[PDB]
Amino acid sequence: VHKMALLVPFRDRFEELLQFVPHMTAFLKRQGVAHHIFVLNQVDRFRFNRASLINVGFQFASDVYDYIAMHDVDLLPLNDNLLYEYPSSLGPLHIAGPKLHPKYHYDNFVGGILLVRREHFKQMNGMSNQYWGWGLENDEFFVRIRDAGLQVTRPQNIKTGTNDTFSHIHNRYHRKRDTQKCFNQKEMTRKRDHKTGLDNVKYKILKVHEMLIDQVPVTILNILLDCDVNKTPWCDCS
């Protein structure tokens, strides 16, 4: 039996989380996937850093989890044929493929829901830490996948399409995307990051909370990320 660490980078998405937990738990129980949900709550006051939270969650998750799912909290599978299985030796298994995602349709999109073996994640030194605020972190990770000699696989013979494979309950005016650029964020985050990753993410876990949501156990990690403003000053544009 494989076990999946279901990693949910998180800040101020409480109602999303209330829908997320019962839905994913039922969904995964139906296909027999053993798993645990880790809410990666970024409690520092820097801009949202999804990828660094993933790195922290990977470090925290015990050895029993031999793969991880990096998972948006607002993106729910509607098709039971989307198998959250242990990825093959080829590399990561991308569940929310561009032919299936309601919004993102470019070929190398690996955002939303991406399953990665422990060994492969380690092999790539996890995700880049330089992505403060919305965007690009998954795209650079795609390059990390190619550079590691791995490939992305996606489920075949899925019959649903872009409008009926996932619900993406995300109103752009309610949950705003932090797309601000300051300092030379534009230039720096558009290039491959060979310098940061799993092995040097800087952080403290202030608190671990064990939460039951209608009987389903879920772990909350209160994560205080560090920002080195000598390297990534765009962690805060205030």
Ligand X SMILES: O[C@@H]1[C@@H](O)[C@H](O[C@@H]2CO[C@@H](O)[C@H](O)[C@H]2O)OC[C@H]1O
Distance CA 125, CA 200 (A): 9
The answer to whether 154 contacts Cl ion (rule: CB under 5 A) is: yes
Size of the site for ligand X (CB under 6 A): 8
User: Which residues, in sequence order, are CB contacts of 97 under 8 Å at separation 6+?
Assistant: 109, 154, 155, 158
Q: Which of 4, 13, 87, 93 binds ligand GDU (CB under 6 A)?
A: 13
Q: Which of 158, 170, 205, 224 binds ligand GDU (CB under 6 A)?
A: 170
Distance CA 12, CA 26 (A): 24
Distance CA 145, CA 121 (A): 9
CB of 104 to Mn ion, least distance (A): 10
Token pair recorded at residue 37: 């949900």
Query: Is the Cβ of residue 2 or residue 154 nearer to Cl ion in the bound state?
Result: 154
Q: Which of 19, 83, 85, 139 binds ligand X (CB under 6 A)?
A: 139
CB of 204 to Mn ion, least distance (A): 27
CB of 139 to ligand X, least distance (A): 5
**CA angle, corner 137, sides to 8 and 112, nearest 5?**
45
CB of 211 to ligand X, least distance (A): 27
Nearest to 81 by CA among 5, 165, 23, 20: 165
Q: Which of 135, 148, 158, 160 binds ligand GDU (CB under 6 A)?
A: 135
User: Where along the sequence are the contacts to ligand X (CB under 6 A)?
Assistant: 104, 109, 111, 135-139
